[PDB]
Amino acid sequence: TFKQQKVEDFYDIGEELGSGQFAIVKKCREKSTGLEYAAKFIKKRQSRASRRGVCREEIEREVSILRQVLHPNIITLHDVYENRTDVVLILELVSGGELFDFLAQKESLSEEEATSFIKQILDGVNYLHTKKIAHFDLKPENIMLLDKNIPIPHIKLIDFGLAHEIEDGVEFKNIFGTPEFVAPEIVNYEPLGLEADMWSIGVITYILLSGASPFLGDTKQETLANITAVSYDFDEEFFSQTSELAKDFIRKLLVKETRKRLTIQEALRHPWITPVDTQQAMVRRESVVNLENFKKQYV
Amino acid sequence: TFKQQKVEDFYDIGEELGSGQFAIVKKCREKSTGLEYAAKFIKKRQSRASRRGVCREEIEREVSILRQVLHPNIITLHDVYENRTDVVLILELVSGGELFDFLAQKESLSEEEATSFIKQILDGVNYLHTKKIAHFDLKPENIMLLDKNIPIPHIKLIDFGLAHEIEDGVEFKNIFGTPEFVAPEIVNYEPLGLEADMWSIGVITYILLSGASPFLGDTKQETLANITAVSYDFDEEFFSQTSELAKDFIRKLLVKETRKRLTIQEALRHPWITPVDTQQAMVRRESVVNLENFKKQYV
Ligand SMILES: [Ca+2]
């Protein structure tokens, strides 16, 4: 159930935080408490054939999933309102900007520091996967920071518009997501599961370390072909300062066969995320991110 | 190659006619002639990773295809300008609005009259397929009229944003288009050809006669499933006045196997389009379009 009231009776609506093509997000403040939040206005789809808005069934799904999740690295749902046109989700305010845009301003970044941000993401996704929840839209712009003005920023995974609970012995197939970041089973219209998220993590890791994107072609047709042929390389132009541990981590994620891809638990336990001896920790410490190419590709 | 000049040096730019995600159209008039056209501004994509704009390569392809086609049922290109941000296609002015919107305002409509509009579409597609051009975006909003105010409106296929030349021995695969109208090979990411256009015609015919949509589900996920298993029917609620010839036409278009689907020439020869005896033509004349459900689903 959604509250059948005028949201603006209870919240002062403020400046825009961004706007997808299916939602508009704005700062707000609950009048009764004075606490700040984000108000995510979702336009309800008015007809079955319509390409505008979202069908209330999928909004309900997003809400149902948000309600199950409480974790430091996952956006927190506060409330839901509804009128004739929109459903409005009141969500924890995540104002710190994107992770990538924080990194783009660093003057130095080691793999050690890099892995510490990546672990925050793995913690969030581990939590969802344990609850059998697939995010299905992991990509830099859904990786945000609470506050970009503290020494080590806190990551929050946002936007559960495509998230889905995965049911055993129940097949889920659909096509969606940003081509650059989708797993081969999405392009190939094959059974989807928690594995797609793991693929995305590899692609995001690849970009964070190097500035390059593994499968991105000159056109979408090219991107999809690269994905499905699992066609990519570790160009020395961009990867010459990247550790073998890093590449091994990536290599084990960018795999077509869903059952051979590292799970979230295995990713957390990979030596590049969780060194098992001093030697590995030193190597990681001595490997640097390609800030120069990273900054360049992301501006 | 595109004229590297300021479009408005040569045209008076008028009112906005329409706009999509990747183009905006304004009415215009060439100064030297006084003749009117439509100026289609297409924003150039500025980076490979960017999701905004169209890459020049695909704009070139669209232009390249339009320059090859002169046929009374196909929009006719006049010129192309280019500036810093945009490529501007100067195109024949098609002002009569959408075919569907005109049908929806109709009092009565027989299958004989319906096949008359469908034939116009088949003529345009036949011309295209002869030249090995696949349109790849056959759907209602891309089927316009020159003048809705004459007894028998003149149909014009528009929007070659997705059109592609099909090369023998060259595999083309991609994912695109409107879910309601895409063939199974698009959804399954299989080799694409001229056959996809024939599927689309099937769907459009289904809708035109009945007002209902063969594969339309409650969500995209469902639409994609229906398409792939070719799951549809002729609900008597809507098809009770529709001839067996019409349904046979649709049946032979909505087939999964690309090799068994009717080609464009076979469509053109189908008895529902091209009756061989007085008996068939009577039946057509006596079967009525479901204007009532049609108006409802589209207006
Ligand atoms: Ca497939």
Swiss-Prot record, chains A, B:
Keywords: Apoptosis, ATP-binding, Calmodulin-binding, Cytoplasm, Cytoplasmic vesicle, Kinase, Nucleotide-binding, Phosphoprotein, Serine/threonine-protein kinase, Transferase. One of its GO terms (cellular component) is autophagosome lumen. It catalyses: L-seryl-[protein] + ATP = O-phospho-L-seryl-[protein] + ADP + H(+); L-threonyl-[protein] + ATP = O-phospho-L-threonyl-[protein] + ADP + H(+). Residues 280-289 are annotated as: Autoinhibitory domain. Expressed in peritubular interstitial cells of the renal cortex. Isoform 1 is found in the adult brain while isoform 2 is expressed in brains of embryos and young mice (at protein level). Disruption phenotype: No visible phenotype. Activated by Ca(2+)/calmodulin. It is found in: Cytoplasm; Cytoplasmic vesicle, Autophagosome lumen. The active site is at 137 (proton acceptor). GO terms for biological process: anoikis; intracellular signal transduction; neutrophil migration; positive regulation of eosinophil chemotaxis; positive regulation of neutrophil chemotaxis; protein phosphorylation; regulation of intrinsic apoptotic signaling pathway. Its main location: cytoplasm. Its EC number is 2.7.11.1. ATP binds at residues 17-25, 40. Residues 11-273 form the Protein kinase domain. The autoinhibitory domain sterically blocks the substrate peptide-binding site by making both hydrophobic and electrostatic contacts with the kinase core. Belongs to the protein kinase superfamily. CAMK Ser/Thr protein kinase family. DAP kinase subfamily. This is Death-associated protein kinase 2. The gene is Dapk2.
